[PDB]
Amino acid sequence: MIIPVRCFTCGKIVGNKWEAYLGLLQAEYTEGDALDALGLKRYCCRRMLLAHVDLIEKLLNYAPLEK
């Protein structure tokens, strides 16, 4: 639902790159160039950022249980 912390394969930290990745994408980067800007050179970490579906943004459309 949320960006993983580490790459499943190598263990590189990708948790701090989702927001930067999105900011680069709205900056008219291609996904490949964006992944290059964040330093994801192994295709495992590129897999992590490139195949992520941010479902938490949809789960935050529901009001919480307590106000």
Binding site: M1, F8, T9, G32, Y43, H52, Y62
Partner: protein
């Protein structure tokens, strides 16, 4: 103007996207229900006859109008409030709306003393509502509005909520009605049989099947007979024709044979005439029909009346049930005989039972209409009895008390709740499997269950013909998605652009045909039918025409302009036989296609331009259909269509194949369904693999729905880190797999590493699993309610106590609160208590009835919900949360039928690594590829390596000539990798290079619901069944495993007699009986006082102890129940 090939792949998919923006994936369910509520209920209410009751005063009670309000709920105080579907799910309510009917009761006694009293909005019942239909509170709501209501915006709807349970109506296949089908049964007295399941336009009775058969050769020739309804004896066709008023043989053959220049037909009908010459007038023929019937009246008068009523009502209702229709019925029965003779003369082909042009899909609307007809008839009956018992006393009555609304309400609710489709009393004549529980395991499973079709041939049937993938399923049913168990080919799935017609009235078409140059059937002379073309509308021969070609041109122009003919109307011109069959009825599966001009598409570039700005200029799919550019073609009209697979087929070629195409595919990949549209490169797999994936995408974990936090589902699996596939098809954009994916992209290496992945198994990375790889959470909901059914005994939620409760287990109840309910966040292990319920007795005055955890779960309480159920006692739902970390024995699958369990997990230092230290997440065995021929797995792995190295999503759409393996390899060689996806790997244990370069890359894997922890089970002297003292059945019952007949046979072959006796006697049900040595019948033993005696023989000394299974004692006693004397003689 023309769309060039280089733009085509965009244009077509743009068109496809517009379709899914307009329709969706559950459009058939919603349209069926909408037609049922808008039209079918009103038609059913009006088609019921007014109930005239009189002792004197009389009352008619005519029902005239219906009103279906929005779904509401009535509390105990009775305040109506709008009920939201999520509240229905949580509170175990039924998402139903009240149906009110306007009733008109006029008093007529004498002397023109007439006065009408109208009861506006008389509450006649409650009708369950399909979600996201027009009459659903979630109709037209925005995604923000749905999220405000705790609903998922991606939820398709198309299901009902009955008692909190989401129920989905499965479309039921049936042979089309009002159509003549000539078959030939090999083993039967008849050579050829022409059947016609006839049913009037607005259904009020079942389908009345009429058969017109030919007796098999071996008196002199072949005799034609007719098996009329309600008559248990064959009847010659000539007798039926005379009974309809056609006595002269010339008239009968005018109606049967339209071309008198054809002696073959003549000699083949001659035996039937020769067999019916003694009967020569209408009354005598009617008497013969009545005599052959199963109720032969002693007096010929009532025989003739009965025959008249049968031939006017039960024979061919679709032709007309009123009087003076004998001409139409005679023409139609003559057409049936003509079709039979054409089949017997070889001039026409026998009809194919499996052709989907001959089938209809009974959807939610027409199924609920069947229920509503039965239930409204029962309601009117009950009203008749209630009003009769009052007017017999000569006084007025209150219709509000006559209407017991529970008939309609409880009937629809029961039928949708259980699936037994029919009256609750006829629970065995009713057909189950309709209305199943919606599958909420993954979004693909939900979509597929909502697009599920069913062929009710019966799973027991071992004839493969109905299970075969017929040619006519193309574009209408997924070729791949089908269960591989006992229902192969019977349970089917819609193709993506397949639309089941909702139904329409033939009135405008018939009126236009009248205004057009068609000639009615009663006004013509039969001599004109020879060269003319017949015109059937919904099976009824309505007239004839002289130029069928320009008639078809006119009708196609009318349908393409959205004129009087609506889009779903099928219009088939059979040319060799001069019929023109027009269909407007419901259940016709069809699909959209691009119309083709001389040799060009009508879809010009301007349509693609307007479709690109679909969100600004509101140019939608319906504007594409209204432009005459797209057309819905049904299975039966496809027979007359010449399709182009792609616009490339419309190019002029060195040798032209067709050069006269009429339509084009929007894209061939639309022949696949929801679950097959997720397979990447399915045209590079063996088809069984695609079927197995289509079945296994439905057990894959993911996020089954966005609003899973609020749902109290019995079972739910949510994946921690779902990922969209790196290699995807262009159809998942509409399945919403990208928004709710059900897997993870795993670096998979196809290698033989340590031997722990052999025979369909995988080696997973323990380090990856530690990082959340394929981790899931399992949510289990327990429900409970405290019933105050009566003052005799009442249940209540309260923390039990050791001093007052009787059936209190030794498990500790400290985790419960004073309210008797555990609190969220509390860690609960197996056998623990989550709800403390106590029931008052008639360990005193209350017994423990607490709800324990399903054993061996060990979760944490996710949340607790308390509310009131329909009747209004306290009702609790507790959701417990258990994190499932993948382990040895958990089942995983790719999208290519490649399933396997985790054999072992190695840490990152133990796994093999590339020069750049990439270890595989999964290692699968190379031996799973060759026999299976899942080359799509390898192409997906290579495409995924390219996608990950390039920063894109691979296009694995099935039939795409712009993507082949050589292009992908050339792309991969540009990123510094071996072009075929191989890499040098190093042994993780020793660090030495592996001699064989391993094939490794990203592949989309799925974690399936089948985890080993939910399957492991053991027993050693647990509970036993009551009837036969043998181990229980199931893990949940702590039962034992069945040592079956085949195990007995295996151990007999082994010769292991003591092991066989241990398994079948000592480990199952050891027992002792006392037998009389004289009569061999079980005696009476009293081991405390040591007095053994047989009442039969009156002896108490010659008794013997026998060690036998309890099941054998039970057998012998059940035989003695049957007056059999099984005497166990010990000598």
């Amino acid at each position: 103007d023309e769309i060039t090939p280089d733009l085509w792949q965009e244009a077509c998919w743009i068109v496809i996207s517009s379709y899914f923006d307009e329709k969706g994936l559950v459009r058939q369910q919603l349209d069926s229900f909408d037609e049922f509520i808008q039209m079918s209920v009103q038609r059913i209410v009006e088609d019921a006859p007014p109930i005239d009751l009189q002792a004197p005063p009389r009352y008619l009670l005519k029902f005239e109008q219906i009103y279906l309000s929005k779904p509401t709920h009535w509390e105990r105080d009775g305040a109506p409030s709008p009920m939201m579907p999520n509240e229905a799910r949580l509170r175990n309510l039924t998402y139903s709306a009240p149906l009110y009917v306007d009733i008109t009761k006029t008093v007529i006694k004498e002397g023109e003393e007439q006065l009408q009293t109208q009861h506006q909005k008389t509450f006649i019942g409650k009708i369950p509502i399909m979600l996201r239909s027009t009459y659903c509170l979630l109709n037209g709501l925005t995604d923000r509005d749905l999220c405000e209501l705790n609903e998922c915006p991606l939820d398709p709807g198309g299901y009902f909520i009955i008692n909190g349970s989401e129920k989905v109506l499965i479309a039921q296949e049936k042979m089309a009605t009002n159509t003549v089908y000539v078959f030939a049964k090999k083993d039967s007295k008849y050579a050829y049989t022409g059947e016609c399941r006839s049913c009037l336009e607005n259904s009020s009775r079942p389908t009345s099947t009429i058969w017109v058969s030919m007796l098999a050769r071996g008196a002199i020739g072949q005799r034609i007979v007719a098996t009329l309804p309600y008559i248990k004896q064959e009847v010659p066709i000539i007798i039926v024709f005379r009974a309809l008023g056609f006595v002269s043989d010339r008239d009968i053959l005018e109606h049967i044979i339209y071309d008198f220049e054809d002696p073959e037909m003549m000699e083949m009908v001659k035996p039937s005439l020769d067999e019916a010459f003694v009967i020569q007038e209408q009354n005598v023929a009617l008497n013969f029909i009545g005599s052959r019937g199963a109720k032969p009246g002693v007096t010929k008068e009532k025989r003739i009346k009965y025959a008249k009523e049968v031939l006017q009502k039960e024979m061919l209702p679709h032709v007309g049930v009123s009087d003076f229709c004998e001409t139409k019925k005679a023409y139609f029965l003559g057409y049936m005989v003509h079709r039979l003779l054409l089949a017997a003369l070889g001039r026409r082909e026998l009809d194919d039972r499996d052709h989907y042009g001959n089938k209809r899909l009974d959807l939610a609307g027409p199924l609920l209409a069947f229920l509503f007809r039965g239930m409204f008839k029962n309601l009117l009956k009950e009203v008749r009895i209630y009003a009769q018992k009052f007017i017999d006393r000569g006084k007025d009555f209150n219709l509000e008390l006559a209407i017991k609304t529970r008939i309609i309400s409880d009937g629809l609710k029961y039928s949708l709740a259980t699936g037994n489709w029919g009256d609750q009393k006829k629970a065995h004549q009713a057909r189950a499997g309709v209305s199943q529980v919606l599958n909420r395991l993954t979004f693909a499973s939900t979509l597929s269950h909502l697009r599920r079709l069913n062929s009710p041939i019966g799973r027991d049937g071992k004839l493969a013909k109905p299970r075969q993938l017929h040619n006519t399923l193309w574009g209408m049913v997924c070729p791949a998605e089908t269960p591989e168990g006992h229902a192969v080919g019977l349970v089917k799935n819609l193709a993506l652009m397949a639309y089941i017609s909702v139904g329409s009235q033939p009135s405008p078409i018939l009126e236009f045909l009248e205004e057009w140059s068609m000639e009615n059937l009663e006004e013509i002379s039969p001599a004109a039918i020879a060269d003319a073309t017949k015109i059937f509308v919904n099976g009824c021969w309505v007239g004839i025409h002289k130029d069928p070609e320009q008639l078809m041109n006119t009708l196609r122009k009318l349908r393409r302009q959205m004129d009087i003919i609506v889009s779903e109307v099928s219009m088939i011109r059979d040319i060799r036989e001069r019929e023109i069959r027009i269909y407007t009825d419901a259940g016709r599966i069809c699909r959209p296609l691009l119309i083709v001009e001389k040799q060009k598409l009508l879809l010009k570039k301007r349509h693609i331009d307007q479709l690109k700005e679909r969100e600004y200029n509101n140019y939608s799919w319906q504007d594409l259909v209204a432009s005459g550019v797209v057309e819905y073609i049904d299975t039966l009209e496809e027979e007359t269509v010449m399709l182009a697979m792609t616009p490339d087929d419309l190019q002029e070629k060195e040798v032209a194949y067709c050069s006269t195409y009429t339509h084009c595919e929007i894209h061939p990949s639309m022949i696949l369904g929801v679950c097959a549209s997720i397979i990447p490169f399915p045209d590079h797999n063996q088809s069984p693999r695609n079927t197995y994936q289509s079945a296994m995408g439905k057990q894959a974990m993911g996020v089954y729905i966005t609003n899973f936090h609020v749902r109290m589902d019995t079972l739910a699996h949510v994946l921690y880190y779902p990922q969209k596939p790196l290699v995807t098809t262009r159809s998942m954009e509409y399945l919403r797999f990208r928004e709710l994916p059900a897997g993870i992209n795993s670096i998979v290496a196809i290698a033989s590493y340590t031997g722990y992945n052999q025979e369909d198994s995988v080696i997973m990375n323990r380090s990856a699993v530690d990082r959340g790889f394929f981790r899931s959470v399992f949510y289990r909901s327990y429900k409970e309610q405290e019933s105050k059914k009566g003052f005799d005994q009442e249940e209540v939620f309260e923390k039990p106590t050791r001093e007052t409760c009787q059936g209190m287990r030794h498990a500790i109840y400290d985790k419960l609160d004073d309210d008797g309910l555990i609190a969220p966040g509390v860690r609960v292990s197996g056998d623990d208590v989550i709800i403390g319920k106590t029931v008052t007795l008639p360990r005193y005055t209350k017994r423990d009835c607490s709800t324990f955890l399903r054993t061996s779960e060990t979760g944490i309480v996710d949340q607790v919900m308390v509310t009131l159920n329909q009747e209004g006692y306290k009702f609790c739902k507790i959701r417990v949360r258990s994190v499932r970390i993948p382990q040895i024995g958990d089942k995983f699958a790719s999208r290519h039928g490649q399933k396997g369990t985790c054999g072992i997990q190695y840490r990152q230092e133990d796994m093999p690594f590339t020069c750049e230290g990439i270890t595989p997440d999964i290692i699968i065995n190379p031996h799973a590829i060759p026999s299976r021929m899942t080359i799509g797995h390898l192409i997906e792995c290579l495409q995924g390596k390219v996608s990950a190295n390039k920063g894109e999503i691979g296009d694995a759409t099935p039939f795409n000539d712009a993507v082949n393996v050589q292009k992908i390899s050339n792309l991969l060689s540009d990123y510094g990798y071996h072009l075929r996806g191989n890499e040098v790997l190093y042994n993780g244990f020793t660090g030495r290079k592996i001699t064989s370069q391993i094939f490794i890359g990203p592949t989309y894997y799925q974690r399936l619901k089948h985890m080993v922890d939910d399957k492991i089970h053991s027993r050693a002297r647990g509970p036993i069944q009551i009837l036969n003292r043998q181990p229980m059945e199931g893990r949940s019952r702590d039962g034992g495993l069945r040592f079956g007949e085949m195990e007995r046979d295996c151990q007999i072959a082994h010769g292991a007699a003591q092991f066989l006796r241990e398994r079948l006697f000592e480990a199952s049900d050891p027992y002792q009986v006392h037998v009389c040595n004289l009569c061999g019948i079980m005696a009476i033993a009293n081991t405390r006082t040591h007095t053994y005696e047989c009442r039969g023989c009156r002896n108490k000394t010659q008794i013997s102890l026998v060690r036998m299974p309890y099941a054998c004692k039970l057998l012998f006693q059940e035989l003695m129940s049957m007056s059999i004397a099984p005497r166990m003689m010990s000598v």
